[PDB]
Amino acid sequence: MAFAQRIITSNSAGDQEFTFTFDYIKEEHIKVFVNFVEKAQGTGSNEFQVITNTTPKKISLNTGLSADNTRVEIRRVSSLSTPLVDFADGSTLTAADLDTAEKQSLFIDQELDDALKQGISIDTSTGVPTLNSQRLSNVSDPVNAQDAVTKAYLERSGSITSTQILNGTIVDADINASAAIAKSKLAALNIV
Amino acid sequence: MAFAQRIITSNSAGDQEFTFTFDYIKEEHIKVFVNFVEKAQGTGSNEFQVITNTTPKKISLNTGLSADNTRVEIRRVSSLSTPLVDFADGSTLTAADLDTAEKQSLFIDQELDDALKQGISIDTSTGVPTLNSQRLSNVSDPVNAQDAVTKAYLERSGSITSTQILNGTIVDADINASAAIAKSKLAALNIV
Amino acid sequence: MAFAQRIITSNSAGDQEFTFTFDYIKEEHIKVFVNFVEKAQGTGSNEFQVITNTTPKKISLNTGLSADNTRVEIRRVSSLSTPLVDFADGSTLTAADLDTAEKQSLFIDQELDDALKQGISIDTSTGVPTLNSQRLSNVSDPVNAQDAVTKAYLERSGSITSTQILNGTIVDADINASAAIAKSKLAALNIV
Amino acid sequence: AARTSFLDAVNRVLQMLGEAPVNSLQGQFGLAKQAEVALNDVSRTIQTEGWSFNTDLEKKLERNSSNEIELSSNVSRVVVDNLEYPDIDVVQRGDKLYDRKNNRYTFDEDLIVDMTTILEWDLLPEHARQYITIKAGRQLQEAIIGSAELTKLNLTQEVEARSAFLEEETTKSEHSMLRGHLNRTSPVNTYIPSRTLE
Amino acid sequence: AARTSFLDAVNRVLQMLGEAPVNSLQGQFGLAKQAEVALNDVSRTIQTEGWSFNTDLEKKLERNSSNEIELSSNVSRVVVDNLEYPDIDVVQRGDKLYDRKNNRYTFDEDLIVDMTTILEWDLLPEHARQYITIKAGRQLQEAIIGSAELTKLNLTQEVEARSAFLEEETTKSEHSMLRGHLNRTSPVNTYIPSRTLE
């Protein structure tokens, strides 16, 4: 399963609290997203706070949900910019510092694995990549002979060419009645 | 090169010995997959065994393959959920523990990097991570406009609409001769 | 901003200086790429050196570029195949070694995250994977059309299926003037 | 405060033996191998008896191309109900079932059995972990040192641990006499003569 | 964690004796061979009694040309049904049967007997493996060193192991008193007096 994240599709407007199960080192390592908007941490004016007293722990929002079916994501990120423990000479080493370093490293690796799996992984069914029923988006207009095709590039005016046509399926149902077709470009039925 | 994963297509049925070159920590950290089937470690009815008395070290199945060209994969995955060291107070700190912790961290990072490379990897000359001669699949039928097309969608009944056709190619090469084409739905003609 | 990479499109030909901001441990960990061609580090027969005397640090080449708008890439990479610091028994512990080990681990994690981001990300506007408007190539032909359609397969003569063309837009734009359309393929209009 | 880990169990076993705690398990330069083998052996000995947390009900078994049933590597015991199969008597032998009555290694149809598996350390519950740790420490000390006072203290601790583990198991899995054989789907209400008289 | 193997059993016996573990079993240079011999001897001693997993019922025996019954090298005991054969009773002697009533070594037709076989270490089930291991360890320790308190401790462990083994056997085989001698096919439903009263 996902190691340090949980994605919830809300079910009722006005709710405030959502539960989460994974572990963490410091409270400021928890991030909350509301409808693709990152949510700041704090209290009062800040919109959410963490309740670490009840099992399982849950996060409480200071303002109720405006509309139901609004996605809320709880994901843990450790400090990727600075080490959590600094060693200085003359200090008596204790197991707490070493354990903190080990937990930081392991949690960072777990989160990286989670992100890699959540992205485009490899479908083990045939050993091929999969999107897991997603939509590929923001792909530039193909140029090279081996790119993928886009709906925009396929549907832009004049996209289909003469070589892009194979005969046999000029359906009469979709043939326009009001179309103006010159007789020179037309065929000649052989009426016996 | 592939740091900690070797995938081999079995040449002939009945073969049982395969070789590997990556380093490891424990004999239980090596996993073998055979076309999605998972094989348990051990000896006896256990369907694969490890051999270390010969360089390079090699694994051995306990039953020959039924058919040739069956994919066999050897991958090393160190512990991801449980640390290999947990410092306890009152012990005698030795360099072996620190070296083992360093090795575990390095091996985890190597395995994650190799998994990312095994996935879709950046196409340097272009920029999008190329599938590298693989059939991306397991994408559901299109739901929105920009969603890509699948086989069961592009070959599905009812996909014929009134937009994408063009002119300049349609000939007798594929039009059914025995088909009764409506004269009125067909085009015009002047017989001079 | 990527932690440990920077891509520069040369403003003009003949320049030899390029700046960078990220920190590092050893200068041997700095790789310089130009036009997807790797250049060695050193002096004389080499192509580039590293100047750390000023701030911010910059790298200098031994020869100017041939043409303007040339791709120049500078990215850090730490030692993956060997731990930077090994612990020996029978000596005095120093905080410098522990700090160096922590720095190496953090830098490797940063670099891996940067690689994943420069590869495949998830857009924070819709939550679907995005490519940041790049170009995809080296994709094998879709044996099943579950795969994204390759434009070579689209534009290949006769590769278009009869259902790929959707009748309804018949005009005189693309019928060739001298196209000898098979006469027995269209009827006549009901001329009164 | 998470559950007990393998390293904590090894440290506890060493401490009960009377030595200094060890830092880790990997590449150790001490008694880690002895502690590990003791813990594994005691875990296997406890598991091979069959409890409520390592038993599957009405599991289907499938034969191979030669009408032969092959068990997995970690299957400890296999039970077949007598009443459902009045003509077939099976007993486990190595890793294959044996048709005792007909003196054959072959069968005519698939079976519905209930088997007991041996679980890894990570998947055990807390009370099982505690009992396993204490028993392993007692056995290791008794086999290695052989003193008197340490043996007495370990005996007392082991007795207390066994009492606690058995009590936890029974209150968790609510064994009953009225229900009879558990393979029957519960028809019992267990109505309470202690409540409804007012 | 698979079932106990030969190398693990040998290491366990050596550890119970109190001597360092061995690396392998082939081409070793220690007491591992003596431990193997003790294991084999205790295995034979236990198996020669006749339990649920090593007894074949209704088995048919075939004679050779000289009208004699020959037994394999690993056959421990045979029993014939007195009711089924009134005028002939047999007792095992070496590898041949003796018709002690008629004082002849020759029979007239084939027999339908119950046979008990001594099995190799591979085919033995888990509880039998554990009991064999503990018993062999105790016997070898007594033979090598010769203490008394160590014998007391090993006797305690052996008693516990025997209790566990017997409980496992009686839970597996499901013996009964109503059914009588098992050579008759089960007509008993063992209908439960407890539950079906509501």
Numbering used by the authors:
A (entry chain O), B (entry chain M), C (entry chain N): 1 to 192
D (entry chain v), E (entry chain u): 2 to 199
Please give the exact wording used by the authors of the publication that reports this structure.
Here, we report the cryo-EM structure of the cyanophage P-SCSP1u, a representative member of the MPP-C phages, in its native form at near-atomic resolution, which reveals the assembly mechanism of the capsid and molecular interaction of the portal-tail complex. Overall, the P-SCSP1u virion possesses an icosahedral capsid with a diameter of ~600 Å and a short tail of ~190 Å in length. The recently identified MPP-C (Marine Picocyanobacteria Podovirus clade C) cyanophages, belonging to the T7-like podoviruses, contain the smallest genomes among cyanopodoviruses and exhibit distinct infection kinetics. By using single-particle cryo-EM, we finally determined the structure of P-SCSP1u in its native state at 3.2 Å and 3.8 Å for the capsid and portal-tail complex, respectively.
The portal-tail complex of P-SCSP1u consists of dodecameric portal protein (gp16), dodecameric adaptor protein (gp22), hexametric nozzle protein (gp23), and hexametric trimer of fiber proteins (gp28), in a similar organization to those of T729,32 and the MPP-B cyanophage P-SSP723. By using the symmetry-mismatch reconstruction method, the asymmetrical portal-tail complex of P-SCSP1u was reconstructed to 3.8 Å resolution, enabling us to study the detailed assembly between each subunit. The cylinder-shaped P-SCSP1u portal, 170 Å in height with the largest external diameter of 160 Å, is formed by 12 copies of gp16 that are arranged around an axial central channel. Similar to the portal protein of T7 (gp8), the portal protein of P-SCSP1u is composed mainly of α-helices and can be divided into five domains: C-terminal helical barrel, crown, wing, stem, and clip. The clip regions of the portal provide a basis for connecting 12 copies of the adaptor protein gp22, which bridge all other components in the portal-tail complex. Each of the six fiber trimers of P-SCSP1u (gp28) is fitted between the nozzle fiber dock and the adaptor fiber dock. The platform region of N1 tightly interacts with the helix bundle regions of A2 and A3 by two pairs of hydrogen bonds (R766-E20 and D737-N24) and one pair of salt bridges (R766-E19). Collectively, the dodecameric portal, dodecameric adaptor, and the hexametric nozzle in the portal-tail complex are intimately connected with each other, with a total of 60 hydrogen bonds and 18 salt bridges, providing a stable platform for DNA ejection. The succeeding loop of the dodecameric portal protein constitutes one of the narrowest sections of the channel, which was previously identified as a “valve” and suggested to function as clamps to retain packaged DNA in the phage T732. According to the radii of the channels, an additional narrow “valve”, which we named valve S, is identified in the P-SCSP1u capsid. Intriguingly, an additional gate, which we named gate 1S, is identified in the middle of the nozzle located between gates 1 and 2.
